[PDB]
């Protein structure tokens, strides 16, 4: 009858015999244990080794499995995804559904995980009370049997499913059997852009409650105008038989100190003509001068809810952490405890490179620490309710959480086809309602979300209203259908730009500054997704932050996103590598579009992370004469763990330093007077750097943690001295094939056929492996490629514009190559034209001046045709013969930085090992650039000027030809790229041209100069 | 919702209709026990949504109703908003929970008096004249049930109509009700007689309260 | 399977295989007939004489009833309330529920009306198109079989439940 009913193709049936949702229970039988949050004897983990067998469909499951173990089955760890154990492929797809769109139907071939466990139950659990089993997460649907008998059915992969096992169990041995289906009608609401996996991927537990039990409880905190008084209100629901002797006590604790307590019998206020709830009571506790919860200072009290007799016998106790805080929208501003928030948020999926979508405490803690160490204060549960511990950790460490229903129907056509259909309202309603019922007591949750990318339908409006009616303590947001519909309290677009409108029909993405002031618009704007961090990205990030700070109602956003969704695969030798979409045989796939993280799957930072840290700083700085002005962007805390270190240096050489304690009130200002600095004699630019240092450890950071920094140019002394006049004069030697120049043990050779420096010698050793040549292209970045799908191609993307114009296949044609002897130098003059099919794209005009001191001065002047797409870079490249250990530079660093992503980099003298000058993006591209460089040192070589550069063992050609980073081989020598000008990287999104006009190489005429010598 | 022909006839003859979802949970304690429970939202939504889908093209229907005597629960709020979103062309009304809740566009009490307050706890029935001017109240008031016409009744009917005519925002109401709910029974001869509650051995019963 | 599920005691199942609701349809194949609101050949009333047997519970219904007319059963007019034919008592109660207040459960003693009708369907409807049946009002819940096979289930006493019969019907008697 179970195989006959086919409940997994019926959206009308989303569970069978499932218990009601409720907040985290442990059924403590001792109050002190509840208060301290110690383990509960009444809550057991069924995690560990289980029996598992795979089947191609549910009809292939033998009727024996219900009563007897299958010897074919293996023993696997639960929780797990069965794709992580090799049983079938994980599918990566973005928009297009991973099954045929035929709702409510799924494929007849529907992979099926048969799980089972043989486990003990103690006798004490069956004489008194109620034993339930809790599956925290099962993807995507399942039937359950206990000792051969059918218990029930559940859908929604991301919320706990609970069943009463009381009548099913026996003392001693019992057997659970779970048939998990990969696909169900639930799948139609689970089209998030991520790995599609399956199985019992979250905790399994057994919970014993008394027959007379606390079955639900809500905590509210409300405040007077200045937050100096609060009323904690607790509504408590019971199940079982009503008795006059029953009582509830809610007591509230600050550490070991009890601050408030209330006790009452059951029976609520009159509600309507038929009375009130005899099975509920509300307790109200006064709290004077409450310690308020925020992401800045996560103050928590403990609330213990005791169900007991009037005489004092405890029946059970539940408990939660309480954060006293108010969230409201007033006059178009989102306020926390009366202060306008600035959301430094990131979207975070649940992902681990080894365990797939199984989460554990350590990874969660690691994520939290990294976020807070990098100046994040908020996280969005993209796009489903998370593992229950996540909320607890956000409560305790202090992050703001957007809790989001597990609803995404992105692949529907149009996007609201299911969400506007009243037949899908039941399935949708349980995903919203059961989330609110579970998470409503976590202070860290400040906003509810109705899901993701499912257009805007009537069902959203209804469920919007349901939440407002049930929980008025939190605003509700939802982006679908244009980000400002009647189903959201917050204008919450994805990838809306700062200044540029994108006026798509029906769902335009207005410039965020313009959106706020549309006639009639009052709401605050907080981007649910912005600054797409796919590969070499986060260009233009500073621009968002400049707008966030200037516009009160622009209250920030959530970066997309936190972690690369790469999975570990093994090679022939058993070495690990990172795999993306289409690497598991899966198709259709969206390839590398799954990796948009600020961190790699193993939590190693991308360079972009430091740019987010710098822009998200909580201290702002201004310099006037000798005075630094520090402004706090903290809303609640003083700077009680902050000191300012300042340093003045001349071209990287320190001249002075000092330390000044920070004592800044929230939103306040401090003036710091610098002492007179010793104005030096020698040339160069003076730079002031300041850093905010946290002297003491916190729960989330080590001692000495740098939380903010800033740099300013001070006095510049321009060099006016003539270099030491040389006695030696270089000697020009000519042949039909070459111009050669000699000075002592140095030698330069210019090919008269190509017109490039083909070789240089120090003593007798050759310096080049490839001639020094103009370069106008880069190995394409993910933002240059502009496809969100492997199928979809775009004629407008930068790489496609460059390809179609002939930039990559453009051949250098020599126009001029003269040599001339001067009084103390040899002067080589060249001209070249790069042409593609009769069209002149670029002209390069150069002079090389080798003088008596051994320096070669190169002057370059490039013309770019106004009607060719603006080039990726204007520079030179070559392959040096030398492979050295270190790279030493005076310029912006230490990390990779680009013209539209360099605010975080500082000007100084930097010294890294060669390997650090390469960024291991999984999809290889142009990488490791450093800008604003005045001097570069590598082995015997030194280049001076004002340039950008990258240096590595990988050619721009190898980088653009290889699809994975583990397939790259170090070439012979070192490839050097020296650019005079380099295009912005962009990243406002990654599926359209995103590089702002001021970062495109559009001037038409370009000029840079370089001095190359041997130190 | 009535027999489909009823709407057609109201279209053609000309009567304003309040089309009402088939939801009444009068017997629950408290009256909103089911309507405030999200697990009952699906059942309730179908009774609202399938009514709108069937009847929305009838000119005679001018107001949608969320049902009757089911208290006020969050499911009412959800379904109120669903209708306002799907069909902006008609006000939505619902009396449960005190006749002036957030799930109604119209103050629609049953048996509220003209001049006399009945201040029940939680669900007071204010004088209709006073109700209109409660601080912050803007809505029109139309009684969903008034002048209970049981047996020898309709005393003071004129008092309603005097107030209906004097107060712009008092826009009338619906008498309870049209037809006696008596069934036909026979004695030993074959003579028909009007039977009410209790006359079919039915117990517990509320007797002549059907008429 | 229909006895094991007990869909009438689960508020999560309010229908099975029911078609979407919609405004009144007649499927005219002539525009002038539509305009004039004259009868449509494609819309047929099944009102009239049906076969009917009363039971005290769904467990007491014999399985033979699925494929064969029961001889005990009487011929009755439909539409009707079976209380108006004397099979059991009509109940009058104001506020207090006529069943024990214990959601979602109903009494095991649950009067069960078994309705059936043998009817001809013409062949034109079988070769092409979609043939559905509409029950405008069924108090309070019901299962439906066509020619022995199960079609679907419906609740809500006061709105029409509609079921696609295209795959269930045959040439001749049904
Ligand atoms: O707009 C979106 O594009 C992102 C691209 O990485 C990602 O798929 C998000 O889930 C989706 O909301
Ligand atoms: Mg289903
Ligand atoms: Mg999507
Ligand atoms: Mg049912
Ligand atoms: Na702002
Ligand atoms: Na992505
Ligand atoms: Na590549
Ligand atoms: Na009036
Ligand atoms: Na009555």
8 Å CB contact of C15 and B43: no
Q: Do you find a cis peptide bond into B49, omega within 30 degrees of 0? A: no
Q: Is A415 exposed, middle or buried (0-12, 13-18, 19+ CB in 10 A)?
A: buried
End-to-end CA gap in chain B: 21
Q: Return the structure tokens found at A391.
A: 């909320």
Q: Which two tokens stand for residue B51?
A: 């009514």
What element of type H or E holds A644?
A: strand A643-650
- Asked if A860 and A884 count as a contact pair (C-beta separation under 8 A), the reply is no
Q: What are the phi and psi torsion angles at A759 (to 5°)?
A: -165, 150
The Cα diameter of chain A in Å comes to: 113
The CATH homologous superfamily to which domain A1-210 belongs is Galactose-binding domain-like (2.60.120.260)
Chain C hits for A14, CB-CB cut-off 8 Å, are 12
Q: Does C16 touch chain A (CB under 8 A)?
A: yes
A560 ligand 1 Cβ < 6 A: yes
- E strands along A69-148, which residues? 74-78, 91-93, 112-121, 130-135, 138-139, 141-146
- The residue among A191, A156, A206, A259 whose CA lies nearest residue A45 is A206
Among the options B46, B69, B95, B137, which is catalytic?
A: B69
* Residue A631 CB neighbours (<10 A): 14
- Tell me what percent of chain C is helix, strand and coil, each rounded to the nearest 5: 15, 25, 60
Q: Measured between alpha carbons, how far is A632 from A81 in angstroms, rounded to an integer?
A: 45
- Nearest alpha-carbon partner for A479 in A430, A443, A515, A440: A515
Question: For B124, which DSSP code?
Answer: -
CA distance A1013 to A873: 24
Query: Which residue carries 């991301």 as its tokens?
Result: A158
Helix, strand or coil, per DSSP, at residue C7 = helix
Distance CA C171, CA A442 (A): 64
**C-alpha–C-alpha distance, residues A732 and A745, integer Å:** 14
Q: Is A1011 helix (H, G, I), strand (E, B) or coil?
A: strand
Query: Rounded to an integer, what distance in angstroms lies between the CA atom of residue A601 and that of residue A588?
Result: 23
Contact assessment for residue A10 and residue A106, using Cβ atoms and an 8 Å cutoff? no
Q: Given CB atoms, is C1 within the 8 Å cutoff of chain A?
A: yes
State the Cα torsion B55-B59-B63-B68 to the nearest 10°.
Answer: -40
Q: Select from C23, C94, C156 the Cβ nearest to the Cβ of B56.
A: C23
Burial of C167 (0-12, 13-18, 19+ CB in 10 A): exposed
Backbone torsions φ then ψ of C64, nearest 5 degrees: -65, -25
Backbone angles phi, psi at C33, to 5 degrees: -65, -40
Q: A142 alpha carbon to ligand 2 midpoint, in Å?
A: 10
Residue nearest to atom 11 of ligand 1 (CA): A193
d(CA A341, CA A377): 10
Tokens of B114: 């003209």
SS3 A434: helix
Q: Work out the burial of residue B98: count CB atoms within 10 Å of its CB; fewer than 13 is exposed, 13-18 middle, 19 or more buried.
A: buried
User: Looking at the domain that runs over A617-722, which CATH code has it been given?
Assistant: 2.60.40.10
DSSP H or E run through A851: strand A839-851
Which residue carries 């605050």 as its tokens? A524
Taken as a whole, chain A contains a residue count of 1015
The two three-digit tokens of residue A968, written as one number: 């790259």
- Which among A690, A789, A601 is positioned nearest to A92, based on CA atoms? A789
| Cβ contacts of A643 within 8 Å, gap of 6 or more | A659, A660, A661, A662, A692, A693, A695
CB-ligand 1 contact for A193 (6 Å cutoff): yes
Both tokens assigned to A215:
């079955």
Distance CA A235, CA A231 (A): 13
DSSP-derived letter for residue B26 is T
d(CA A729, CA A850): 9
B200 near C CB under 8 A: yes
Quote the CA–CA distance of C167 and A125 in Å, as a whole number. Answer: 52
List all residues 6 or more positions away from B68 whose beta carbon is below 8 Å from its beta carbon. Answer: B20, B23, B24, B26, B95, B96
CA A330 from chain centre, in angstroms, equals 29
Helix/strand/coil for C153:
strand
Give span(s): CATH 2.70.98.10, chain A.
723-1015
Cα–Cα distances in Å, from A950 out to A110, A784, A876, A898, A912? 50, 18, 11, 11, 13
Residues of CATH 2.60.40.10 domain(s) within chain A?
211-325, 617-722
Beta bridge partners of A162: A134
Q: Closest residue (by CA) to atom 10 of ligand 1?
A: A193
Q: Do B57 and C21 touch (CB under 8 A)?
A: no
A645 Cβ partners below 8 Å, 6+ apart?
A657, A658, A659, A690, A691, A693
Q: State which H helix or E strand residue A425 sits in.
A: helix A425-439
Taking the CA of residue B159 and the nearest CA in chain A, the distance in Å comes to 26
Q: Is residue A272 less than 8 Å (CB to CB) from chain C?
A: no
Contact partners, residue A703, CB within 8 Å, separation at least 6: A694, A695, A696, A697
- Least Cα separation, residue A220 to chain B (angstroms): 18
Compute the distance between CA of residue A383 and CA of residue A431 in angstroms, rounded to an integer.
12
- The secondary element (H helix, E strand) that includes residue B43 is helix B41-55
Asked if C90 lies within 8 A of B200 by C-beta distance, the reply is yes
Q: Is C17 on the interface with A (CB under 8 A)?
A: no
Q: Report the half-sphere exposure of A624 (CA within 13 A, side-chain side).
A: 5
Contacts of B31 in chain A (CB under 8 A): 271-274
Cβ-defined contact of A15 to C12 (cutoff 8 Å): yes
CATH number of A723-1015: 2.70.98.10
d(CA C108, CA A409): 42
Task: Please say whether the beta carbons of A746 and A848 come within 8 A.
Answer: no
Q: Are A382 and A414 in contact, with CB atoms under 8 Å apart?
A: no
CA–CA gap between residue A772 and residue A769 (Å, rounded): 9
The DSSP code sequence of A363-414 is HHHHHHHHHHHTT--EEE-TTS---HHHHHHHHHHT-EEEEE-S-B-TTSSS
Q: Can you tell me which residue has the tokens 């206020």?
A: A269
Residues of C in contact with B43 (CB under 8 A): 11-12, 14, 155
Per the DSSP assignment, residues forming a β-bridge with A204 are A135
DSSP percent split of chain B into helix, strand, coil, nearest 5 = 30, 20, 55
Residue A528 CB: number of other CB atoms within 10 A?
A: 30
Token pair listed for A568: 């570990």
Query: Are the C-beta atoms of residues C21 and C82 closer than 8 Å to each other?
Result: no
Q: Which residues have C-beta within 8 Å of that of residue A606, sequence separation ≥ 6?
A: A533, A597, A598, A599, A600, A919
Please answer whether residues B108 and B93 qualify as being in contact, where contact means their C-beta atoms are separated by less than 8 angstroms. yes
User: CA-to-CA distance for A781 and A790, rounded, in angstroms?
Assistant: 16
The answer to whether the CB of A264 falls within 8 A of the CB of A247 is: yes
Chain centre to alpha carbon of residue A700: 18
One-character DSSP codes across A755-823: -SEEEEEETTEE-EEEEEEEE---PPPHHHH--SSSS---TTSHHHHHHHHTTTTPEEEEEEEEEEE-S
Phi and psi torsions of A533, nearest 5°: -90, 45
Place of tokens 């259709």: A588
Q: Which residues of C13-28 are buried (b: 16+ CB within 10 A; e: fewer)?
A: bbbbbbbebeeeeeeb
- A13–C contact, CB cutoff 8 A: yes
Determine if ligand 1 sits within 6 Å of the CB of residue A529: yes
Percentages helix, strand, coil for chain A (3-state, rounded to 5) are: 15, 40, 45
Q: Tell me the angle at which helices A425-439 and A458-470 cross, rounded to the nearest 10 degrees.
A: 30
Inter-chain residue contact C11 with B57, CB threshold 8 Å: no
Joined together, the tokens standing for residue A78 give 């639960």
- Domain B1-211: give its CATH superfamily: Glycosidases (3.20.20.80)
Instruction: Find all residues with CB under 8 Å of B119, minimum gap 6, and list them.
Output: B125, B126
User: What CATH architecture does domain C1-174 belong to?
Assistant: Sandwich (2.60)
Quick one: tokens of A911? 């010294």
Q: How far is the CA of B167 from the centre of ligand 8 (A)?
A: 4
| Architecture in CATH for domain A211-325 | Sandwich (2.60)
Show which subunits contact C, needing at least 3 CB pairs below 8 angstroms: A, B
A620 neighbors A631 (Cβ within 8 angstroms): yes
Assess whether B145 carries a catalytic annotation.
Answer: yes
User: Token pair of A886, please?
Assistant: 């270190």
> Does the annotation count B116 as an active-site position?
no
Return the beta strands (E) in C17-147 as ranges: 48-55, 74-78, 112-116, 120-121, 132-135, 141-146
CA end-to-end distance (rounded Å), chain A? 85
Residue nearest to atom 3 of ligand 1 (CA): A193
Residue that has been written with the tokens 């109620």 in this structure: A130
State the resolution, in angstroms. 2.4
* Alpha-helical segments (H) within A458-607: 458-470, 512-515, 541-550
CATH class (in words) of the domain with range A326-616: alpha beta
Mutational pocket test of ligand 1: of A453, A504, A994, the residue with most ligand atoms within 8 Å of the beta carbon: A453
Which of C37, C85, C92 is the best mutation test for B, with the most CBs of B within 10 A? C92
Q: Are A14 and A155 in contact (CB under 8 A)?
A: yes
Technique behind this structure?
Answer: X-ray
Pairing of strands A400-404, A378-380: parallel
Residues sharing a CB contact under 8 Å with residue C149, sequence separation 6 or more, in sequence order: C168
Scanning the structure block, which residue is given the tokens 């001889």? Answer: C71
Q: Please name the residue whose Cα sits nearest to atom 8 of ligand 1.
A: A193
B55, B7 Cβ separation under 8 angstroms: yes
């Amino acid at each position: 009858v179970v195989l006959q009913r086919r409940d997994w193709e019926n959206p009308g049936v989303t569970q069978l015999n499932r218990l009601a949702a409720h907040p985290p229970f442990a059924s403590w039988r001792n109050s002190e244990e509840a208060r301290t949050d110690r383990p509960s004897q009444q809550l057991r983990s069924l995690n560990g080794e289980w029996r598992f067998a795979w089947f191609p469909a549910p009809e292939a499951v033998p009727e024996s499995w219900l009563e007897c173990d299958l010897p074919e089955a293996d023993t696997v760890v639960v929780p797990s995804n069965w794709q992580m154990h090799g049983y079938d492929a994980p599918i990566y797809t973005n928009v297009t559904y991973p099954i045929t769109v035929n709702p409510p139907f799924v494929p007849t071939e529907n992979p099926t995980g048969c799980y089972s466990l043989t486990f003990n139950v103690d006798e004490s659990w069956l004489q008194e009370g109620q034993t339930r089993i809790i599956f925290d997460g099962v993807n995507s649907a399942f039937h359950l049997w206990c000792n051969g008998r059918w218990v029930g059915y559940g859908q929604d992969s991301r919320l706990p499913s609970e069943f009463d096992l009381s009548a099913f169990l026996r003392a001693g041995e019992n057997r659970l059997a779970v048939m998990v289906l990969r696909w169900s009608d639930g799948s139609y609401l689970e089209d998030q852009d991520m790995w599609r996996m399956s199985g019992i991927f979250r905790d399994v537990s057994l919970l014993h409650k008394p027959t007379t039990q606390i079955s639900d409880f809500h905590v509210a905190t409300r405040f007077n105008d200045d937050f100096s008084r609060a009323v904690l209100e607790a509504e408590v629901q019971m199940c079982g038989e009503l008795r006059d002797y029953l009582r509830v006590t809610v007591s509230l604790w600050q550490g070991e100190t009890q601050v408030a307590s209330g006790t009452a019998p059951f029976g609520g206020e009159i509600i309507d003509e038929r009375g009130g709830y005899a099975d509920r009571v509300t307790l109200r506790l006064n709290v004077e001068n409450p310690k308020l919860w925020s992401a800045e200072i996560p103050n928590l009290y403990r609330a213990v809810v005791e169900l007991h007799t009037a005489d004092g016998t405890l029946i059970e106790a539940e408990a939660c952490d309480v954060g006293f805080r108010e969230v409201r929208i007033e006059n178009g501003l989102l306020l926390l405890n009366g202060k306008p928030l600035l959301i430094r948020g990131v979207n975070r999926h649940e992902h681990h490179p080894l365990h797939g979508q199984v989460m554990d405490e350590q990874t969660m803690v690691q994520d939290i620490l990294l976020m807070k160490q990098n100046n994040f204060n908020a996280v969005r549960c993209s796009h489903y309710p998370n593992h229950p511990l996540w909320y607890t950790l956000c409560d305790r460490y202090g992050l703001y959480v957007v809790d989001e229903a597990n609803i995404e129907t992105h692949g529907m056509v149009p996007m609201n086809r299911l969400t506007d259909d009243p037949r899908w309202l039941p399935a949708m309603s349980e995903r919203v309602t059961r989330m609110v019922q579970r998470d409503r007591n976590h202070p860290s949750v400040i906003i509810w979300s109705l899901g993701n990318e499912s257009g805007h339908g009537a069902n959203h409006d209804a469920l919007y209203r349901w939440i407002k009616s049930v929980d008025p303590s939190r605003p509700v947001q939802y982006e679908g259908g244009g980000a400002d519909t009647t189903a959201t309290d917050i204008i919450c677009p994805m990838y809306a730009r700062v200044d540029e409108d994108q006026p798509f029909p029906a769902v335009p993405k207005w410039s965020i500054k313009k959106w706020l002031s549309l006639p009639g618009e009052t709401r605050p704007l907080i981007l649910c997704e912005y600054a797409h961090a796919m590969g070499n990205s986060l260009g233009g990030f500073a621009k968002y932050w400049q707008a966030f700070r200037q516009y009160p109602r622009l209250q920030g956003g959530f970066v997309w996103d936190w972690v690369d969704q790469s999975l570990i695969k093994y090679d022939e030798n058993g070495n690990p590598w990172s795999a993306y979409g289409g690497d598991f045989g899966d198709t259709p796939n969206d390839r590398q579009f799954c990796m948009n993280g600020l961190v790699f799957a193993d939590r190693t930072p991308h360079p972009a992370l430091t740019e987010a840290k710098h822009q998200q700083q909580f201290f702002q700085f201004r310099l006037s004469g000798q005075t630094i002005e520090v402004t706090s962007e903290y809303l609640f805390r003083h700077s009680d763990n902050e000191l300012l270190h300042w340093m003045v240096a001349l071209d990287g050489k320190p001249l002075a330093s000092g330390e000044v304690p920070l004592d800044v009130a929230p939103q306040g200002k401090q003036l710091i007077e610098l002492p007179e600095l010793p104005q030096p004699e020698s040339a160069g630019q003076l730079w002031l750097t300041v850093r905010v240092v946290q002297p003491n450890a916190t729960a989330w950071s080590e001692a000495g943690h740098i939380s903010a920094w800033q740099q300013w140019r001070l006095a510049e002394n321009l060099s006016v001295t003539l270099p030491a006049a040389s006695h030696a004069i270089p000697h020009l030697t000519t042949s039909e094939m070459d111009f050669c120049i000699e000075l002592g043990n140095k030698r330069w050779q210019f090919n008269r056929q190509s017109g490039f420096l083909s070789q240089m010698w120090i003593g007798d050793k050759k310096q080049l492996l490839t001639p020094l040549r103009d370069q106008f292209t880069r190995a394409p970045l993910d933002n240059d490629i502009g496809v969100d799908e492997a199928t979809r191609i775009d004629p407008n993307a930068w790489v496609e514009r460059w390809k179609a114009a002939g930039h990559y296949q453009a051949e250098a044609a020599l126009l001029q190559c003269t040599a001339d002897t001067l009084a103390d130098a040899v002067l080589i003059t060249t001209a070249h034209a790069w042409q593609h099919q009769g069209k002149t794209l670029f002209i390069s005009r150069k002079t090389y001046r080798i003088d008596g001191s051994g320096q070669m001065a190169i002057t370059v002047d490039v013309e770019v045709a106004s009607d060719t797409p603006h080039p990726a870079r204007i520079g030179l490249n070559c392959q040096l013969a030398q492979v050295a250990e270190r790279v030493n530079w005076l310029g912006l660093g230490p990390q990779e930085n680009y013209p539209d992503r360099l605010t975080a980099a500082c000007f100084d003298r930097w010294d890294l090992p060669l390997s650090d000058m390469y960024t291991p993006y999984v999809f290889p591209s142009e990488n490791g650039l450093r800008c604003g460089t005045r001097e570069l040192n590598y082995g015997p070589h030194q280049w001076r000027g004002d340039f950008q550069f990258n240096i590595s063992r990988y050619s721009q050609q190898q980088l653009m030809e290889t699809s994975h980073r583990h397939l790259l081989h170090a070439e012979e020598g070192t490839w050097l790229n020296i650019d005079g000008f380099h295009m912005g990287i962009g990243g406002d999104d990654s599926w359209s041209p995103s590089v702002s006009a001021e970062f495109q190489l559009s001037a038409g005429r370009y000029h840079y100069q370089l001095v190359w010598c041997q130190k």
